[PDB]
Design a protein around this ligand. Structure first.
Ligand SMILES: *Cc1cc2c(cc1C)nc1c(=O)[nH]c(=O)nc-1n2C[C@H](O)[C@H](O)[C@H](O)COP(=O)(O)OP(=O)(O)OC[C@H]1O[C@@H](n2cnc3c(N)ncnc32)[C@H](O)[C@@H]1O
Ligand SMILES: CCCCCCCCCCCCOCCOCCOCCOCCOCCOCCOCCOCCO
Ligand SMILES: C[C@H](c1ccc(Cl)cc1)c1cc([N+](=O)[O-])cc([N+](=O)[O-])c1O
Ligand SMILES: O=C([O-])CC(=O)C(=O)O
Ligand code: SF4
Ligand code: F3S
Ligand code: FES
Lengths: 119, 243, 130, 577
């Protein structure tokens, strides 16, 4: 009827990531979109706070490197995880869905890693 | 005096005549006290004797009442006409095979509920030694989750179950969580397999509608999430147990 | 043979379009999109940052679009919706007893929002006052 | 008819049925037990109990106290040897349920807590908030899932038992969904079908407590004992008849008339006690019967409140307080809000006496075995001789697990030393059950079963109520006779096969009519007033231990007549003085 010894699932790995990811984007994502997507391109900032030199100065700092990484990657692992499941909820057949979405994640992750060990 | 009337639309279905369900309409008298179950009784008595449905307690504690009212899973005996003056359409509990009229096949539910071993496991204490010692503080850990009357409304509420009929379900999982969290039970490992399945806690995307409809405020959703956490702990332990 | 013909209603791809509760669920998950899009954007900026002031100015020019400014406003909206709903659900994962009673979620929900507030302030400070 | 082999077949998945099934699987690990029920086990009526289950617990208590409480409350019609076995095995079964998980409420030190019910001097009722029945029925049911010996036949309607040469040989049931008859063979059948409250217009029972089990034992020459004793609960909601637990009062609830007067003080239950401290034995916490009768007296004086749903008196709980209410009366509150639209914190709850528990039932010896060898009965459908003329509060649930276990073990032995029977006969019995069913199916006459149902209820309410007169009891007997003739003119317009409730309700109705007659005749003949049975006519208004300290045995012959016989009550250490 219901299988007596079902195969364990591997979801606790993506769920675990998506977890940390959702939490990071819940606490730090709003402020960041403010700065980067609104304040910055509207000059709504004091003096040279968001100037190339200053941003680069930061991005190149250890903490800045770690922060930029997590700020890009964690959200990805959360978001892609969700889109993956959205596919199902919507009844959209996606070949190798898992590889697609989590792959894309890993790729971008790497890409990001390279970017922060610095171009 | 003079009672008001309500045109109730009931989705009938006879597996010996009908190819598919089809609406029927009945005029039913009612007042500020008239419940759906009351209505269904009236219909069977004076309008259509072949109307079949499940019920018993009449006081929302047994759990056989389950059905859909205007696409919302509810307990007929805790549903009142006074609230549906602008139309009421009654169908068999969603996400279950319609057997006849308002009766659906609850087999999956039952098997699911059975699969998680809902019983104290592994405690050697015997009657003569007295009862276990459990504090209020300890009981609080699972109390809420023990109030499930197995009505099955949560299953008609869960979209993941409607998409994946193999999903053991909200109730099932809550029941399981109920025993896992009982300081008197020692059979958590006997249950994990099922909760760790893809058809277990991991089939839930926290839509949360189940907790929204639970007539007994068990909040199964909260149980599943908590399950996910335990399942995840289990997965780690298993990864580090190369023993 | 049985005289039973169990009718199984079908479940369309538009099931969530019915009841508002489902629609809002969809919306909640819909937040994933603007979220990744923003991560992507952050990568553009990151690499434009590395390809010198020339490139960085090209990135900033992009953000000034203002169609991209609308998309980013939408992104902030989506982001908040996520924070709002996330906070409501997260507490349902903890089973804490405070003196014989299963507490929550209110206490937790309040803390998270508190932490977000302080964080939003500390980052804005850091990113602007110095 | 297909057939199934089983060692013992248990009809009924209620508290009793389940406890029996488990006791049988623990007794004979290799047994094949067929647990049958017309509803999934958890929908049995035991789920609705809210008060609790008695079991000597406290250090200053004694099985003797519980023993005396039971005998006194039963007005000495208790089989004193049975009661003794009972009180001695309660502690064990409640503790055992605790071991199976049942979440009884606790004392801060983690010990289980107990409260007072049924007027007992020493509190000894164990409880699970005010959802005790729910928590027992489910504990039992779920506990029973670990025993592979128990093979359930969920939603199977037992039609009749099979008897030959004084021994039971199985039963015939109907697969409710399939609409097909089935034959289960066993040398021991346990009847655990519950009471028959549903023969009353207004009651606290679930729609399934129709007394089927009793009706079947009647068809096989077995007698129903003490059926005249129908226990009414003083506080039920108008119309629905839904139960407002005694707890509302144990927490300081009061009962007032249209003048706001706590009328119970004028009926010997005075002096009035302060809103604060309610006292056992007094006012709203007085003798059950007196509280129910007070309603009737208030009604005569014209002191009751007239409502669309009928005359009532008010159960006032406001002075209880949020905390207390929600900590000890959460259910009662929700019921009140939902069915009478009343917040027990803001307003008073409209109530009135309601038909509640069936004391009488299938006659059984001290081991739950009936006159038919192999046939047992336990639970509210039986009559182990524990309740006498008035059941003690919280003693019924205790009974389920104390005597359910017994029944289970005994049935196990009884089927192992049963030997074989005449196959052609047993098979001829099944053919009979089937033929009879067809007869009912092909019956025509244009009479609506439901209108008969209604009339029956109205009759039991008017003729066999709280106060009985020979004129009205007779009126009721004459009605039931009539309704029997009408029953034969009933046409079951639904000829379907998948979950045909029209047929099943009709059968159920048949059993009620039979059982209702036992009750009415039993009462009309009992020319005395004892426990639940109170008469107003001269020479009957008092308890007669000279001429009626005996059980009423009601049999139903093949000619449709209800004959009475009387048996003696086993006294042991407590004579009736
Ligand atoms: C009505 C009620 C009774 C009650 C109570 C509250 C209410 C609202 N509170 C109590 C309390 O607080 N303390 C206590 O001591 N007693 C209380 N009671 C009385 C007591 O609960 C009942 O007497 C007792 O629960 C009866 O249980 P029992 O095991 O005898 O059986 P059941 O629960 O009524 O269920 C009957 C089973 O038999 C099956 N059945 C019936 N007919 C058929 C047919 N024809 N075929 C197949 N199966 C059948 C039912 O399906 C059920 O499983
Ligand atoms: C650089 C791109 C690399 C892609 C990384 C994608 C990783 C995403 C992993 C998702 C795995 C999904 O599992 C899919 C199979 O369906 C079965 C589901 O049940 C679980 C079965 O166990 C899972 C098996 O997949 C294991 C993944 O192993 C990691 C991949 O290592 C790739 C290294 O590439 C470098 C070589 O050039
Ligand atoms: C409850 C669980 C969770 C996850 C991550 C964290 Cl950090 C905390 C709780 C959880 C939460 C949500 N949520 O929307 O809030 C969704 C799902 N899910 O599977 O879709 C889920 O499993
Ligand atoms: O109804 C109650 O709460 C207590 C009672 O008399 C019973 O045991 O049925
Ligand atoms: S969790 Fe609530 S809906 Fe679900 S079966 Fe249990 S009581 Fe019904
Ligand atoms: S609705 Fe279904 S998805 Fe999870 S929260 Fe309830 S089980
Ligand atoms: S009749 Fe019990 S849930 Fe409605």
């Amino acid at each position: 009827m219901i299988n007596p010894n079902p195969k364990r699932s591997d979801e606790p790995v993506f769920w675990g990531l998506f977890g940390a990811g959702g939490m990071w984007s819940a606490i730090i994502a709003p402020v960041m979109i403010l700065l980067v997507g609104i304040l910055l391109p509207l000059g709504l900032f004091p003096g040279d706070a968001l100037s190339y030199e200053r941003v680069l100065a930061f991005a190149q700092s250890f903490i800045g490197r770690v922060f930029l990484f997590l700020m890009i990657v964690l959200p990805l692992w959360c978001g892609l995880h969700r889109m993956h499941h959205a596919m199902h909820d919507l009844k959209i057949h996606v070949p190798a869905g898992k590889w697609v979405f989590y792959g894309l994640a890993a790729i971008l992750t790497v890409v990001t890693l390279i970017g922060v060990v610095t171009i | 005096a003079e009672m008001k009337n309500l045109k109730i639309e009931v989705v009938r279905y006879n597996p010996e005549v009908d190819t598919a369900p089809h609406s029927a309409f009945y005029e039913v008298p009612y007042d500020a006290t008239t419940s759906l179950l009351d209505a269904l009784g009236y219909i069977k008595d004076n309008l259509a004797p072949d109307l079949s449905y499940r019920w018993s307690c009449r006081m929302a504690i047994c759990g056989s009442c389950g059905m859909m009212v205007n696409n919302v899973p509810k307990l007929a005996c805790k549903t009142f006409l006074r609230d549906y003056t602008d139309g009421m359409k009654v169908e068999a509990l969603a996400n279950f095979p319609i057997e006849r009229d308002l009766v659906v096949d609850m087999t999956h539910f039952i098997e699911s509920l059975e699969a998680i071993k809902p019983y104290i496991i592994g405690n050697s204490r015997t009657a003569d030694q007295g009862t276990n010692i459990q504090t209020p503080a300890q009981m609080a850990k699972y109390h809420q989750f023990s109030g499930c009357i197995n009505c099955g409304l949560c299953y008609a509420a869960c979209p993941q179950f409607g998409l994946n009929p193999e999903f053991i379900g909200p109730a099932a999982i809550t029941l399981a969580h109920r025993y896992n969290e009982d300081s008197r039970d020692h059979g958590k490992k006997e249950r994990m397999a099922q909760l760790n399945s893809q058809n277990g806690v991991w089939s839930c995307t926290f839509v949360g509608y189940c907790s929204e409809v639970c007539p007994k405020h068990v909040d199964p959703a909260a149980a599943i999430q908590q399950g996910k956490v335990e399942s995840s702990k289990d997965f780690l332990i298993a990864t580090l147990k190369p023993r | 043979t049985t005289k039973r013909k169990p009718y199984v209603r079908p479940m369309t791809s538009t099931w969530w379009k019915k009841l508002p509760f489902y629609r809002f669920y969809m919306l909640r998950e819909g937040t994933a999109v603007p979220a990744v899009w923003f991560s992507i954007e952050l990568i553009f900026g990151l690499f434009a940052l590395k390809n010198g002031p020339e490139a960085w100015a090209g990135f900033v020019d992009f953000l000034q679009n203002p169609v991209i400014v609308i998309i980013n406003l939408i992104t902030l909206a989506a982001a908040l919706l996520h924070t709002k709903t996330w906070f409501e659900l997260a507490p349902k994962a903890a089973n804490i007893i405070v003196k014989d009673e299963k507490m929550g979620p209110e206490p937790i929900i309040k803390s998270l929002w508190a932490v977000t507030v302080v964080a939003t302030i500390v980052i804005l400070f850091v990113a602007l006052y110095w | 008819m297909q057939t199934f082999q089983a060692d013992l077949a248990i009809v009924g998945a209620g508290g009793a049925g389940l406890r029996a099934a488990i006791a049988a699987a623990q007794a004979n690990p290799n047994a094949k037990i067929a647990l049958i029920s017309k509803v999934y086990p958890m929908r049995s009526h035991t789920v609705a109990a809210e008060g609790g289950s008695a079991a000597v617990a406290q250090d200053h208590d004694s099985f003797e106290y519980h023993f005396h409480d039971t005998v006194a409350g039963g007005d000495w019609l208790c089989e004193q040897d049975v009661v003794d076995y009972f009180v001695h095995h309660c502690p064990t079964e409640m503790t055992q349920l605790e071991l199976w998980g049942c979440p009884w409420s606790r004392r801060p030190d983690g010990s289980v807590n107990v409260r007072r019910f049924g007027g007992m001097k020493i509190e000894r009722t164990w409880f699970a908030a005010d959802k005790t029945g729910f928590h027992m029925l489910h504990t039992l049911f779920q506990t029973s899932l670990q025993f592979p010996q128990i093979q359930r036949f969920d939603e199977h309607f037992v039609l009749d038992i099979l008897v030959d040469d004084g021994h039971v040989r199985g039963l015939v049931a109907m697969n409710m969904m399939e609409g097909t008859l089935v034959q289960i063979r066993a040398n021991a059948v346990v009847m655990a079908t519950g009471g028959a409250g549903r023969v009353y217009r207004y009651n606290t029972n679930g729609g399934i407590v129709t007394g089927d089990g009793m009706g079947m034992a009647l068809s096989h020459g077995v007698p129903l004992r003490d059926m005249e004793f129908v226990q009414y609960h003083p506080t039920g909601l108008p119309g629905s008849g839904i139960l407002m637990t005694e707890g509302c009062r144990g927490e300081g609830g009061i009962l007032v008339n249209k003048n706001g007067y706590r009328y119970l003080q004028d009926y010997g239950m005075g002096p009035e006690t302060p809103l604060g401290e309610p006292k056992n034995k007094y006012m709203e916490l007085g003798p059950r019967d007196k509280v129910s009768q007070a309603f009737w007296h208030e009604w005569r004086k014209g002191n009751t409140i007239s409502t669309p749903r009928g005359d009532v008196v008010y159960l006032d709980l406001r002075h209880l307080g949020e905390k207390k209410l929600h900590e000890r009366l959460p259910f009662i509150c929700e019921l009140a809000k939902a069915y009478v639209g009343v917040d027990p914190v803001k307003e008073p709850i409209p109530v009135r006496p309601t038909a509640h528990y069936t004391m009488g039932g299938i006659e059984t010896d001290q081991n739950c075995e009936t006159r038919i060898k192999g046939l047992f009965a336990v639970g509210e459908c039986s009559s182990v001789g524990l309740h006498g003329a008035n059941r003690l509060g919280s003693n019924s649930l205790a009974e389920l697990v104390v005597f359910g276990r017994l029944a289970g073990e005994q049935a196990t032995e009884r089927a192992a030393t049963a030997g074989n029977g005449n196959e052609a006969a047993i098979e001829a019995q099944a053919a009979g059950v089937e033929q009879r069913l067809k007869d009912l199916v092909n019956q025509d006459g244009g009479e609506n079963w439901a209108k008969i149902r209604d009339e029956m209820g109205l009759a039991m309410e008017e003729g066999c109520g709280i106060y009985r007169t020979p004129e009205l009891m007779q009126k009721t007997i004459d009605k039931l006779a009539e309704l029997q003739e009408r029953f034969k003119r009933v046409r079951i317009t639904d000829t379907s096969s998948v979950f045909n409730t029209d047929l099943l309700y009709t059968i159920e109705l048949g059993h009620g009519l039979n059982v209702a007659e036992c009750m009415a005749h039993s009462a009309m003949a009992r020319k005395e007033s004892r426990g639940a049975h109170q008469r107003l006519d001269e020479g009957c208004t008092e308890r007669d231990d000279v001429n009626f300290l005996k059980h009423t045995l009601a049999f139903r012959d093949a000619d449709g007549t209800t004959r009475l016989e009387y048996s003696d009550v086993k006294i042991t250490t407590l004579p009736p003085a």
